[PDB]
């Protein structure tokens, strides 16, 4: 996945 | 890369120890409400893909054996391991129906040198229990 701010 | 490899045929084993009733000699009261917790936890961890089994009112020896045996199984095709403990407790220790046992001893069974098949894989423990008698009065 991709941590998204 | 930066994430644990979850590409295994099995997410993993999940042990839930649900302690509600304790031997009168321990002086600990019935943990009402702990059954809702265990059922709710069961559904959640099942949905994640864990093969969960629930054990009720375990003795310190039971808990120890339960985890020792689990650490001796073959986790070669599992992605991780999870254990949930619901009970009375004190600093660093947790109650069985017959007394207290060190949380340290329950978990060290999964050390990398004592469970080769879970090496480099996550070992998870969720502990619902007191750790002393301090009260957090809060603030606004």
């Amino acid at each position: 996945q991709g941590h998204g701010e | 890369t930066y994430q644990y490899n979850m590409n295994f045929e099995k997410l993993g084993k999940c042990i839930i120890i649900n302690n509600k009733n304790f031997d009168k000699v321990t002086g600990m009261g019935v943990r009402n409400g702990t059954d809702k917790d265990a059922e709710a936890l069961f559904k959640c961890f099942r949905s994640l893909g864990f093969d969960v089994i629930v054990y009720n009112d375990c003795s310190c020896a039971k808990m120890q054996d339960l985890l020792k045996k689990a650490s001796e199984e073959d986790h070669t095709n599992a992605a991780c391991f999870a254990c949930i403990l619901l009970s009375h407790g004190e600093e660093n220790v947790i109650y069985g129906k017959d007394g207290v046992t060190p949380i340290k001893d329950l978990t060290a069974h999964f050390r990398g040198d004592r469970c080769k098949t879970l090496l480099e894989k996550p070992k998870l423990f969720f502990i619902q229990a007191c750790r002393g008698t301090e009260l957090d009065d809060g603030i606004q």
């Binding site: - | 809702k36 949905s47 619901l86 502990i127």
Partner: protein, 92 residues
């Protein structure tokens, strides 16, 4: 060669030296919260993100109720101890 203590994660319902609350009719605070967050984001959030939202829910949505003034209106904050070496996702 890796540390024998590596890859463990302890998610305690409360901090060291403190009590842990449990409403007899709904279940312990920590578990009610853990399950809400998990049945909602267990498959799309990293473990630490999940446990962090759990800390917040416990600390915000709960407050003890008791006819005993000493145990009246008390609060709680969970405690996450991580020796994990990677990010953890329950999917794919």
């Amino acid at each position: 060669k890796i540390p024998v203590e590596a890859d463990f994660l302890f998610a305690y319902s409360t901090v060291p030296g403190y009590y842990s609350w449990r409403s007899p009719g709904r279940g312990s605070w920590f578990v009610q919260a853990l399950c809400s967050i998990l049945e909602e984001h267990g498959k799309d959030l990293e473990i630490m993100q999940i446990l962090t939202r759990v800390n917040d829910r416990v600390a915000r949505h709960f407050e003890s109720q008791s006819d005993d003034p000493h145990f009246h209106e008390k609060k709680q904050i969970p405690c996450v101890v991580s020796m994990l070496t990677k990010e953890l996702y329950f999917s794919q």
